[PDB]
Design a protein around this ligand. Structure first.
Ligand SMILES: *[C@@H]1O[C@H](CO)[C@@H](O)[C@H](O)[C@H]1NC(C)=O
Ligand SMILES: *[C@@H]1O[C@H](CO)[C@@H](O)[C@H](O)[C@H]1NC(C)=O
Lengths: 49, 50
């Protein structure tokens, strides 16, 4: 069971994420059961001219 | 859920993912209607000693 949680909260600090408490509601349960051991972050770059 | 009780229309705020609800420890007091979206409230009906 792939429990995905998300909580979009606005903030005015750029770095050094502030303290406090927040909740995380389950988004959607994904059907899983395969073997996963390595997570890879995939970002997006903005090619200019 | 299964059993006996009073089904009332409370004002609890049930989140979309939430389905059931307990009170203190494994005592269900409010559920969600399977067909519709309205929120019920399972309340134990009148009891007491004579
Ligand atoms: C998943 O694959 C890795 C890769 O070698 C292995 O070490 C691990 O035991 C595997 N886990 C399961 C549950 O198959
Ligand atoms: C389920 O069926 C009942 C039958 O009248 C209907 O009132 C209700 O709106 C239906 N629920 C959904 C989610 O379609």
């Amino acid at each position: 069971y792939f429990k995905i949680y998300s909580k979009h909260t606005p903030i005015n600090l750029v770095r050094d994420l502030p303290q406090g408490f927040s909740a995380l509601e389950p988004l959607v349960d994904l059907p899983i059961g395969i073997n996963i051991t390595r997570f890879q972050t995939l970002l997006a770059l903005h090619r200019s001219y | 859920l299964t059993g006996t009780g009073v089904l009332t229309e409370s004002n609890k705020k049930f989140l979309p993912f939430q389905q059931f609800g307990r009170d203190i420890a494994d005592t269900t007091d409010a559920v969600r209607d399977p067909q519709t979206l309205e929120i019920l409230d399972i309340t134990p009906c009148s009891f007491g000693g004579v």
